[PDB]
Design a protein around this ligand. Structure first.
Ligand SMILES: [Mg+2]
Ligand SMILES: [Mg+2]
Ligand SMILES: [Mg+2]
Ligand SMILES: [Mg+2]
Ligand code: NA
Ligand code: NA
Lengths: 300, 300, 306
């Protein structure tokens, strides 16, 4: 049983709700006891001490806390713990599915993410009018999950449009997310990958696999092995092992009947996790087909 | 016989062109006489008084006005009128097609939307170099329509990436627009919907209907153009699917399938018909036979 | 035998590496000798003189340079040369392929683009904490290519979501990029186009051609990927379609259809050919028969194919 801990800079709403927490240096620890406590003065790091304060226009406060998770298998029991979990994944300290990422939607506050920092939904229109005295008020989004890069930039990674990567995404070194790529929380790449399509929550893509432009990986839990290629505008509703290809523009769902080299057919889920597969739609017959790659024959 | 009115904060370009207008509290009124006037000092609300001024770098001014629309049936006469219209839609005071939204392209100014506020295209490169003395100059878009959330955040809504929702989008409570979702002006949801695909101008989606990742509603080459389409209640569009006809309630389009008005679909009886002949019907499942390649429709 | 030159405002990282360079007024010149120099005080334009400095929080410096390319056929020599090239394209002084755009990835620095300006990856987490004393730190992206519009807004153009157009995109007058549109460097439009899908590096779209929402031009598995494709004039790609061969003029690809170079297509004579064999032809309509599921190509003008 592994725990985790982190000193964080939390922003709270006027009613005390946790809007976010930024943890500069999260870490894994021995299993222990779940709790968030307000840091005493002498325990606030100097770089965070200058950041603590109250924003009278937003009606928020920023405070320095320490959050401990006694066990990463427990569900998050509050926003601080949820944020810590998401930082652990994004710092690559834990791989997707290495901690319990359940219930986070239920636990996290819906936030107005602005060029002035996090704001509550409550009284936002009045807050917008106050903040406008400072200059333009830009809302980047309204949601429970903020932009990963606004908490951590992981190394060895490119992200062409960082609006498309949620905090809690795990991007292994050599990974590039292009504009059309999207990576959800508790999801991402284990190695080097070109990501130009959508990686759903819980989806993991193995080393050297690429997701083509506008490809869709369904939540379902689905994963892709190593060296797979999803063609642009393709779709995947089953897991793939290694060395699989889904053709450009083909949506393969779990219930899609696929014809095999022996002319027999099976639902695609019967092939889930298999290697060396190439999925295509025949351009003469319209039929979804599966071919064996590299003289490897097909395993159900 | 329904009009509208609003006190707004307008930004004018160096030549007088209306770049935008922010109306904190638009309202429906009895039918009246269309006009925009400058507020006298004593009529500018207090929260707005502090936001009036002139920006010498941008060569703009910000002014307090009152815009009255005599009849929501009339076409927008000027950009203030047009802005007031789009705010009514996004405030949900009016539903899509609840007011005349024609002709906005011709009325609206093309604007450079920046982290320093709206700017004219004319002389923009000189303006950029002046603003750079304040800090980085970031252009969010160049277009006639700005980002909804920069005017109003409607309640009961999530928007993962607020670049994707034009001012004028109507998003009923319970609606979530995900990253791949997009909602144009005079379009949106009437109830609780998960939007992860594209809602074109004029398109309305009924309560309970979900739009899968990357779905296209009424996109290019979906059909002969004339009438806008709409989705009813409890519909489901699969990821990367497409729709060029109206659906009633309880319809499904399978993932990956584009049903255009001119797509020939085969019915349970073996008889085929063009999809437009089914436009607006309920309880329909559209799918592509993974075996014969044919587009079929089934009852659900 | 054409060169180019420009006065630029360059931002350097703490270790001296070039993060970016903004050239307000690039220009084409006779062929010459490539070099970037630091401008002398008297040669700094008044507008840029105000913008030179050192940021202690980011540990960067902004300096005024002059960059010259001796020949546009030469590969970029360094990042200043690289940014000059991308400016010439986005200023429409050079159309795509009008200059050597090879090798940029290798020459360009990977940059954290923030609401406080370009930053190095190195020491970024300490930079963030420092910058947060000024207010929120927003990272727009971590990439070797920044956003076009943050260098030049070309006239006659609309761009609904400017995160989706890389510096180096060429967008001719009358072009609109919608939210789902995307334009890469050394790529874009030659005339008036509605762009609601994705234009890859090196892809050129002819006057009056429209790219439907979600359309994929030259995307992953669209073709053996050795040569770039282009679209001629008055072509139309349906929403959610894909294209992996070049089209001539007056071609249409139906909504939702992916035409790859290796797709077999049935012609009107009932013969069939790989789509690559039609590459560059005019007056074609590609569709998948909704009854038979076969990919088919028709002539669009009453006048055949073969
Ligand atoms: Mg590796
Ligand atoms: Mg997209
Ligand atoms: Mg953005
Ligand atoms: Mg011709
Ligand atoms: Na964006
Ligand atoms: Na033209």
């Amino acid at each position: 049983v592994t725990g985790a801990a982190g000193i964080g800079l939390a922003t709270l709403a006027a009613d005390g709700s946790v809007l976010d927490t930024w943890f500069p240096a999260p870490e894994l620890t021995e299993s222990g006891t779940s709790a968030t406590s307000r840091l005493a003065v002498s325990d606030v790091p100097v770089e965070l001490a200058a950041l603590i304060g109250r924003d009278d226009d937003r009606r928020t406060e920023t405070i320095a806390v320490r959050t401990v998770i006694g066990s990463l298998d427990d569900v998050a029991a509050d926003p601080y713990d949820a944020y810590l979990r998401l930082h652990l994944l994004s710092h690559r300290l834990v791989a997707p599915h290495g901690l319990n990422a359940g219930g986070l939607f239920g636990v996290l506050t819906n936030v107005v993410w602005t060029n002035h920092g996090p704001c509550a939904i409550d009284g936002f229109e009045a807050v917008r009018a106050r903040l406008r005295r400072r200059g333009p008020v830009t809302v980047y989004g309204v949601d429970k999950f903020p932009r990963m890069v606004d908490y951590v930039v992981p190394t060895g990674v490119r992200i062409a449009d960082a609006d498309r990567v949620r905090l809690g995404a795990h991007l292994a070194p050599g990974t590039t997310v292009m504009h059309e790529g999207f990576v959800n929380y508790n999801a991402g790449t284990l190695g080097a990958s070109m990501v130009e399509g959508r990686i759903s929550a819980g989806v993991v893509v193995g080393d050297g696999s690429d997701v083509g432009g506008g490809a869709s990986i369904m939540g379902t839990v689905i994963s892709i092995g190593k060296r797979c290629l999803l063609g642009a505008n393709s779709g995947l509703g089953i897991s793939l092992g290694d060395d699989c290809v889904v053709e450009a523009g083909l949506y393969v769902t779990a219930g899609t009947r696929v014809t095999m080299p022996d002319s027999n057919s099976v639902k695609a889920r019967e092939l889930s996790g298999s290697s060396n597969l190439l999925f295509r739609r025949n351009s003469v017959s319209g039929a979804v087909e599966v071919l064996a790659r590299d003289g490897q024959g097909i395993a159900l």
